[PDB]
Design an enzyme around this catalytic site. Structure first.
Site, PDB file in Angstrom:
ATOM      1  N   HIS A   1      50.349  43.491  41.161  1.00 61.83           N
ATOM      2  CA  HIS A   1      51.806  44.348  42.021  1.00 61.83           C
ATOM      3  C   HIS A   1      51.218  44.391  43.410  1.00 61.83           C
ATOM      4  O   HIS A   1      51.976  45.060  44.270  1.00 61.83           O
ATOM      5  CB  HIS A   1      52.519  45.176  41.270  1.00 61.83           C
TER       6      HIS A   1
ATOM      7  N   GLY B   1      48.185  55.729  43.940  1.00 62.82           N
ATOM      8  CA  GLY B   1      47.093  55.070  44.720  1.00 62.82           C
ATOM      9  C   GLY B   1      46.082  54.969  43.865  1.00 62.82           C
ATOM     10  O   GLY B   1      44.983  54.209  44.109  1.00 62.82           O
TER      11      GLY B   1
ATOM     12  N   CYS C   1      46.117  53.073  40.916  1.00 60.69           N
ATOM     13  CA  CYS C   1      46.216  51.452  40.443  1.00 60.69           C
ATOM     14  C   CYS C   1      45.006  50.777  40.670  1.00 60.69           C
ATOM     15  O   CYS C   1      44.557  50.981  41.677  1.00 60.69           O
ATOM     16  CB  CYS C   1      47.467  50.822  40.806  1.00 60.69           C
TER      17      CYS C   1
END
Ligand SMILES: CC(=O)Nc1ccc(NC(=O)CN2Cc3ccc(Cl)cc3[C@H](C(=O)Nc3cncc4ccccc34)C2)cc1
Ligand SMILES: CC(=O)Nc1ccc(NC(=O)CN2Cc3ccc(Cl)cc3[C@H](C(=O)Nc3cncc4ccccc34)C2)cc1
Ligand SMILES: [Cl-]
Ligand SMILES: [Cl-]
Ligand SMILES: [Cl-]
EC number: 3.4.19.12
Lengths: 305, 306
Positions: B41, B143, B145
């Site tokens: 993503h 942030g 991820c």
């Protein structure tokens, strides 16, 4: 979202752990530049511990009686000296992985990360607090002596604890990196005990702010209190007194949440007087006191190192 | 003595964390040898998240649209591919700090350490468990991820989780390092509520054995139970069923303490009925389920305090 008992990343400290052996005793040492720091009791047999004269025990040792192993490499000890309850072994190799560091002595209520070690090999990392009675509720087995506690402020490791012993109640005692014990403890085999402990009030309030930030608000109420009335209640429940300094330190959390410190003190007073009535706060049925106001702000802001 | 939620030392994983940027999105990546792994993503905008077509978004990207930063050094992307929900960016530098590692997919009830990271920089380490509903109760902000979960039994890092998203209930979902999600979750903004969660019974029993090893027996009783009667009771308290595999796995802890598994099941049945009556077990007023039998054996003394 979420709130966990989080330790600092331990990599910078892992690169400093070594194994120190003197005779039949093996424990851990901390290698910074060309010195290895470890508990001075590494030079004692069990009988020496009953009444040790460390200077007399130490004078009988040569540099080569200390075997220091860093990974699979033997370091060469070229000098030795004692500072309070820590032995400093000068080695002939500066640690190439020495981080930027300081030795800091912490106060009760402060938290720190512990890198548990055995035979110079790190095994685990966890977070704990220096209790008001100067003990730590650690998790340590025989062989863990010399494991260290630390915090990281910006890019600098602040070493604050070196592990020396376990007390009869299963709690732990140790020194700062200058070898001064936290608490009225000595490094000998004699009757010693943890004193009665108290709860760290400013930390419980910080954790109640963490719960509000994470959406747990059931304990909030319309009431407020004075600092004096709140302290009369804290003493009754074996909580540490709350000072104006603690109130000032919690200011930012009061402003973010719209819950003044004395308004949160009124929530804490009601929790002490009535319990949780089957409810939990951040997944706990007890009031948690091992998160400082700084720990809450850091975990809720994502500070990196 | 003592019993703490203990994570593995994070150093070997810290040496693999990098920052990955695509357009205005920055998240974390894991750099092992000459490949950087990160959530796919990273190539999306927020609007793309309702029904992203990852193949169509990715075909429009070149190697040089991906910026990878390792410390203060820019790495050069020389290849890219998608494997399930992970993007693999081939870089022109092998990570000199690559530890010995494996990718392992874990089952619910298993625990692992999480190294929470932001902008490729580690912030903290904590322990958690893969819940029975395939979510994790982490501590993650925007942030985070690309932060990973791992175990380090015997010097080899076993990577088991990569963080992708936070669900509306504040719990977390992610993938193994091959990009397969744990649970019925997708990397798409859509209704995908986690199933009702349950308590990991085998772990609660392991933690009761930890308490006995550490010197506490107050919660034991004179009774035993059959496995089936235990499961009928436990399911009424939203506890996972205990299987014969779980009983077998508890064998070593049973031998060390001298308490038969089904005898410890009778103690758990009684605790669920009575509560703790003002007492605590290993410093907790709730029954803890994020320590596995293996974790207890790792942390506790091999000599019970009788
Ligand atoms: C219920 C009860 O009585 N428990 C108990 C009974 C005996 C002991 N200690 C010893 O057998 C020998 N120790 C004496 C001693 C004296 C003074 C200094 Cl400065 C250090 C040390 C060492 C020490 O405490 N090391 C340790 C450190 N951390 C965790 C341990 C876990 C188990 C055993 C040692 C550990 C060695 C501890 C706990
Ligand atoms: C209580 C509550 O309402 N929590 C909450 C609040 C906000 C969001 N998400 C967003 O604002 C934007 N995100 C959309 C999205 C969609 C799909 C995929 Cl695959 C990833 C992502 C990203 C994402 O979930 N990143 C994150 C990851 N971990 C922890 C976060 C914590 C706060 C915000 C982002 C986090 C980005 C999710 C949950
Ligand atoms: Cl597993
Ligand atoms: Cl959903
Ligand atoms: Cl036994």
């Amino acid at each position: 979202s979420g709130f966990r008992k989080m330790a600092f990343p331990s990599g910078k400290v892992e690169g400093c752990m070594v194994q120190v052996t003197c005779g039949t005793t093996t424990l851990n040492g901390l290698w910074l530049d060309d010195v290895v720091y470890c508990p001075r009791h590494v030079i004692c047999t069990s009988e020496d511990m009953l009444n040790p004269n460390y200077e007399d025990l130490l004078i009988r040792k040569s540099n080569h009686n200390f075997l220091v192993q860093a990974g699979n490499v033997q370091l060469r000890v070229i000098g030795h000296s004692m500072q309070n309850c820590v032995l400093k072994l000068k080695v002939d190799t500066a640690n190439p992985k020495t981080p930027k560091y300081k030795f800091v002595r912490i106060q009760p209520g402060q938290t720190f990360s512990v890198l548990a070690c055995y035979n110079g090999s790190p095994s685990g990392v966890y977070q704990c607090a220096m209790r008001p009675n100067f003990t730590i509720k650690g998790s340590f087995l025989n062989g863990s002596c010399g494991s260290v506690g630390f915090n990281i402020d910006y890019d600098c490791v602040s070493f604050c604890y070196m592990h020396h012993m376990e007390l009869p109640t299963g709690v732990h005692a140790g020194t700062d990196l200058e070898g001064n014990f936290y608490g009225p403890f000595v490094d000998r085999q004699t009757a010693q005990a943890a004193g009665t402990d108290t709860t760290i009030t400013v930390n419980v309030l910080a954790w109640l702010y963490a719960a509000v930030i994470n959406g747990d608000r059931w304990f909030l109420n319309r009431f407020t209190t004075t600092l004096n009335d709140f302290n009369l209640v804290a003493m009754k429940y074996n909580y540490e007194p709350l000072t104006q300094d603690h109130v000032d330190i919690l200011g930012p959390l009061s402003a973010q949440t719209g819950i003044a410190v004395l308004d949160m003190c009124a929530s804490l007073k009601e929790l002490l007087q009535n319990g949780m009535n089957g409810r939990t706060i951040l997944g706990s049925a007890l009031l948690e006191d091992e998160f400082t106001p700084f720990d809450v702000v850091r975990q809720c802001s994502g500070v990196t190192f």
